[PDB]
Design a binder for this molecule. Structure first.
Ligand SMILES: Cc1cc2nc3c(=O)[nH]c(=O)nc-3n(C[C@H](O)[C@H](O)[C@H](O)COP(=O)(O)OP(=O)(O)OC[C@H]3O[C@@H](n4cnc5c(N)ncnc54)[C@H](O)[C@@H]3O)c2cc1C
Length: 453
């Protein structure tokens, strides 16, 4: 129980009632520092712990694919917490109104939540803080090293953040204690109903084909905490060995496929890192994978935490902004609208295949994501319109979207965040370029294009 994982958002008079865990980003019962601290605090106060989750009004800004994945897991989570004698309350509406009202209606003693550097989460904290009188803590249950501990400032490169993070692994990379149940079960609708109503409201905006057939295939990733562990186990046993050599090959499915579970916190990245560390496989593949789930994942939280405008042109490096400004007035070879990007109606069959994989599976291969976002910059009227389009399609169709990794990944592709300058070209300037022929020499593009007609 390292106290550096927890941080106080506001101090107050601790009440004589249950400790409330405002679960948001880490939707799991196991390996959850936020829930573990909540139980520890509730134990010292001789009071039970309770979990509250808010089904917010912004769910209509995504699709059915994300909504069902999240709620199906929450249905499983409600069963796990029950076995621990921990009740779970699911509220519908504004977290500011609902969290504050729950604190007063149930006489909460202390309020706890997990950490997310996203703007929407800060928005909720502001409203909640001004509507409660009890202490309020947040715990980093998503990063191995607490975001505010890994670095005190924005890190402009992976090689400047990698040593800082590895130096702190010996202290923060540790096993998880068991979640002790509640002593006695203490004394707002069912999830099957909130799911049915939500799906009905999302159906008109469901992505379809010409024949009114849904595009999304929901049999690629089963949601839940139990499914995530099976995915983790399969990766270490079968794919981890080849990960280092086939991570950049879209035609081969040699990725961990953990992002949907990591995004919703249905599985702890610290748990994955522990299991990987103790697994014997190709050394370079271990290094490659750990580099992605430790450095690149947690540097994205670092990006969004220390850059209020992480989703804007203002957060780009100075060299990228001055380079992109110098080529604003360059004549673009193609200009596509949002609907044209969305439907995969460009001239580049590789880009359209990447969009089709996004629409059909909700998870685009890591390598094609880079190619996908860079051509949006190349075929847009400006870098600002490119960020807008990339963020829209990413957050709308990726199962792992609306995530710090997404904004940090898009900022890398379009603005060169966490990257260096390259040969100066027109339109894209010094931003790293990825040509069509460059991909042909990297993998069998024809197979990838064929798999997503
Ligand atoms: C334009 C663009 C958009 C992206 N969109 C998202 C997104 O919406 N959500 C998201 O979580 N990630 C995003 N990524 C990062 C990466 O593409 C995906 O995380 C990865 O493809 C997820 O699938 P996986 O778990 O099977 O990959 P794996 O190779 O098995 O890697 C495992 C984990 O390492 C992390 N990781 C891997 N690559 C990156 C990276 N470049 N940056 C940060 N973390 C990484 C992820 O957490 C990932 O789950 C994006 C990257 C780019 C360039």
């Amino acid at each position: 129980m390292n106290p550096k994982r927890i941080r106080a958002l506001k101090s107050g008079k601790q009440g004589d009632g249950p400790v409330v865990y405002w679960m948001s980003r880490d939707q799991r019962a196991e390996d959850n520092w936020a829930l573990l601290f909540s139980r520890a605090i509730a134990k010292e106060a001789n009071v039970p712990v309770v979990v509250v989750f808010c089904l917010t009004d912004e769910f209509l800004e995504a699709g059915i694919r994300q909504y069902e994945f999240m709620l199906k897991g929450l249905q499983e989570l409600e069963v796990s917490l029950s076995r621990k004698k921990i009740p779970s309350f699911f509220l519908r509406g504004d977290p500011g109104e609902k969290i504050s009202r729950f604190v007063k209606d149930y006489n909460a003693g202390t309020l706890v939540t997990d950490f997310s550097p996203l703007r929407i989460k800060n928005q909720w904290i502001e409203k909640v803080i001004s509507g409660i009188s009890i202490p309020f803590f947040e715990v980093d249950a998503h990063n191995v090293v607490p975001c505010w501990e890994a670095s005190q400032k924005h890190e402009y490169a992976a090689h400047t953040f990698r040593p800082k993070l590895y130096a702190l692994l010996p202290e923060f990379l540790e096993e998880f204690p068991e979640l002790e149940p509640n002593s006695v079960t203490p004394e707002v609708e069912t999830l099957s109903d909130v799911l049915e109503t939500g799906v009905k409201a999302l159906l008109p905006e469901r992505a379809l084909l010409k024949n009114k057939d849904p595009l999304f295939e929901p049999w690629h990733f089963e949601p839940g905490e139990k499914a995530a562990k099976k995915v983790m186990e399969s990766f270490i046993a079968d794919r981890l060995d080849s990960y280092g050599a086939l991570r950049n090959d879209p035609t081969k499915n040699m990725l961990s496929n953990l992002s949907p579970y990591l995004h919703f916190g249905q599985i702890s990245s610290q748990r994955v890192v522990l299991e990987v560390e103790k697994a014997e496989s190709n050394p370079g593949s271990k290094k490659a994978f750990l580099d992605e789930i430790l450095i690149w994942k947690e540097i994205s939280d670092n990006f969004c935490y220390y850059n209020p405008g992480y989703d804007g042109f203002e957060s780009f490096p100075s060299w990228a902004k001055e380079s992109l400004n110098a080529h604003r007035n360059d004549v673009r070879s193609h200009i596509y609208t949002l609907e044209e990007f969305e439907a995969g109606k460009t001239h580049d069959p590789l880009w359209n295949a990447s969009q089709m994989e996004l629409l059909s599976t909700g998870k685009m291969h890591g390598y094609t994501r880079m190619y996908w976002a860079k051509k949006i910059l190349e075929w847009s009227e400006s870098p600002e319109k490119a960020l807008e389009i990339a963020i829209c399609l990413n957050d709308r169709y990726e199962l792992d979207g609306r995530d710090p990794n997404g904004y940090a990944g898009i900022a890398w592709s379009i603005g060169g965040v966490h990257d260096r300058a390259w040969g100066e070209r027109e339109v894209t300037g010094k931003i790293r370029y990825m040509s069509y022929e460059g991909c042909k020499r990297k993998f069998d593009v024809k197979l990838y294009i064929e798999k997503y007609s």
